[PDB]
Write a protein that binds this ligand. Structure first.
Ligand SMILES: CC1(C)CCN(Cc2ccc3c(NC[C@]4(O)CCCN(c5cc(NCc6ccccc6)ncn5)C4)cccc3c2)CC1
Lengths: 200, 236
């Protein structure tokens, strides 16, 4: 069901098996690199990403030492890293904002299975876009992912309210409540959670 | 304004639309501090790396990846280089990793030789003048140079230039400026450099060099006392 859907939840404890399969997974984790909903490295490694896809793509934002740790999780979860997107951060005048000042954020791209019918090669691996609020990824990533795999189901982990998109299901603990419209998902959610609460 | 959509539309890479107190006294000090350029033709496949002395403060490693062409070195060959044997206990590495599997295999190399990655430097290639790997999901328009540190202890991490002509494997000279502004020390080695990359302040070692002037004792005399611990950003 095409309009935006979301679940306020602790991604550590949600039974993500109820959500089905997804052509694209995107994650923007609170890496321990703590403030404020940080997951430890083990918590990250233990996230049940492997159930979410059979064939498709993972998009994983990484920074600092998570450039290495995210490569670890992605491999442990069953993906090969086949690309890496770079977002060059600019102001409104198209100017660029430890040893070097950082002018970019990185997003790993992983493949699982044998993804077919995707339009590989439409976009290029560099994003130039104006920075908005702190954190907050550029909306260009969604257009890139839509052109790549149009119409398919997508899931985003650790999104915030502004992240919710058509064709996407968004998980995070700062979303407002639960909003599900896809019938297969509403069914499995009511069975798994008859009282609507999501405990450990 | 969506530059990813623009690129889908027009073929102008999004980086084409990026625009633009002195930092020049630093440069003058680097230049006066610089050792004479030194350089040695050597087939690194067959060459005992240990003959390269003394231990280096900076290593710039630029192996000719097959992807640059579209003898080549694989990540299999690069990993077997004994870089740890010639690196000083506190030293830095800059590894050109390309844009494919090198982004992962280069991190393995760095760990194999005892470094941790402290910076990921991206050479972003514009295509203002001319608007595919099977595993690739996107068009690859950039190359990564990984920075590693080992031991105890003003520039951005982007280089933007126009994509070179096909069969041009040269990397932007801008990387040398970034490295030299760090002031990491004066024993600098460039593995797989060419005649065209030879540069003051650097020892260049590669298979295609046409002339050599490297002498181990002559090279070491540049760093005898009292010059032993200089950063290269300091008056003689
Ligand atoms: C620059 C970039 C492109 C964007 C920024 N990006 C870093 C980044 C990423 C996400 C951010 C974010 N996400 C919303 C949030 O709710 C915040 C709280 C944690 N979280 C959980 C956590 C969770 N369990 C763990 C738990 C629960 C309760 C207590 C303790 C631990 N379950 C679901 N959501 C996600 C908000 C603000 C800043 C962010 C910055 C870098 C790349």
């Amino acid at each position: 069901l095409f309009p935006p859907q979301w679940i306020c939840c602790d991604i550590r404890y949600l039974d993500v098996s109820i959500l089905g399969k997804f052509a694209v997974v995107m994650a923007d984790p609170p890496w321990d690199i703590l403030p404020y909903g940080t997951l430890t490295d083990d918590e990250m490694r233990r996230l049940n990403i492997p159930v979410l896809q059979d064939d498709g793509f993972l998009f994983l934002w990484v920074t600092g030492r998570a450039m290495e740790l995210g490569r670890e999780c992605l491999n442990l979860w069953g993906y090969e890293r086949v690309d890496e997107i770079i977002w060059v951060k600019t102001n409104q005048l198209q100017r660029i904002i430890h040893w070097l000042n950082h002018g970019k954020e990185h997003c790993l791209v992983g493949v699982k299975g044998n993804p077919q019918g995707f339009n590989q090669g439409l976009d290029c691996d560099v994003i130039v876009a104006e920075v908005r609020s702190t954190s907050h990824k550029p909306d260009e990533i969604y257009g890139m992912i839509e052109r790549l795999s149009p119409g398919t189901r997508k899931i985003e982990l650790f999104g915030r309210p502004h992240n919710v998109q058509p064709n996407w299901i968004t998980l995070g603990n700062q979303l407002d409540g639960i909003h599900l419209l896809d019938p297969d998902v509403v069914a499995r959610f009511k069975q798994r959670y008859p009282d609507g609460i999501i405990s450990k | 304004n969506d530059y990813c959509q623009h690129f889908v539309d027009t073929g102008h890479r999004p980086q084409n639309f990026i625009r633009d107190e002195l930092i020049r006294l630093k440069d003058e000090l680097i230049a006066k501090s610089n050792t004479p350029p030194m350089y040695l033709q050597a087939d690194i496949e067959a060459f005992d790396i240990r003959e390269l002395t003394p231990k280096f403060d900076v290593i710039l490693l630029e192996p000719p990846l097959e992807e640059y062409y579209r003898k080549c070195w694989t990540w299999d060959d690069i990993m077997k280089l004994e870089i740890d044997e010639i690196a000083a206990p506190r030293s830095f590495i800059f590894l050109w990793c390309g844009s494919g599997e090198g982004l992962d295999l280069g991190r393995v190399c760095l760990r194999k030789w005892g470094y941790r990655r402290c910076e990921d430097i991206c050479w972003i290639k514009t295509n203002k003048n001319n608007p595919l790997d099977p595993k690739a999901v996107f068009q690859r328009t950039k190359e990564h140079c990984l920075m590693g540190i080992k031991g105890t202890v003003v520039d951005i991490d982007l280089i933007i230039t126009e994509e070179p002509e096909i069969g041009n494997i040269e990397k932007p000279v801008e990387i040398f400026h970034i490295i030299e502004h760090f002031c990491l020390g004066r024993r600098r080695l460039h593995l797989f450099g060419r005649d065209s990359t030879i540069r003051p302040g650097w020892l260049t070692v590669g298979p295609t060099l046409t002339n050599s002037n490297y002498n181990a004792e002559t090279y070491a005399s540049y760093f005898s006392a009292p010059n032993s611990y200089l950063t290269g950003c300091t008056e003689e």
